[PDB]
Amino acid sequence: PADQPVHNYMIKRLDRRSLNAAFSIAVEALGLISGENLDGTHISSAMRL
Amino acid sequence: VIANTNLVTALVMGKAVSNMDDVARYLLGGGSARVRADL
C-alpha cells in the first residue's frame, strides 16, 4: 500500500553547570595595600610593592 | 634613618650599620635657644 509523508517535531532541553575557584589573600597585605597599616618610613613602601 | 644604603642590607642581608654610608665611601674612594638655668 502507498504511504503518506511523515512529519515530526521535537525539542531538546539545556543542561546547566558552573565553575569555581578561590583566591584567598592575606590580612597583612590587605592592610598594607589600603594604607591601614602603613608607616612613614623607607621600609613600608618596600613591602607594599 | 635607614636610607639608600642600609636599606638594601637590612632588607636582604639582615644587618644594618649606623654610618654604612661613610664606610662605603671609604672602601671605594668617594639652632640654639636661651633658657633660665643656674650655672
UniProtKB/TrEMBL annotation, chain A:
Name of the protein in question: Major capsid protein
Organism (species): Suid herpesvirus 1
Shown part of the complete sequence: 100 to 148 of 1330
Domain of life: Viruses
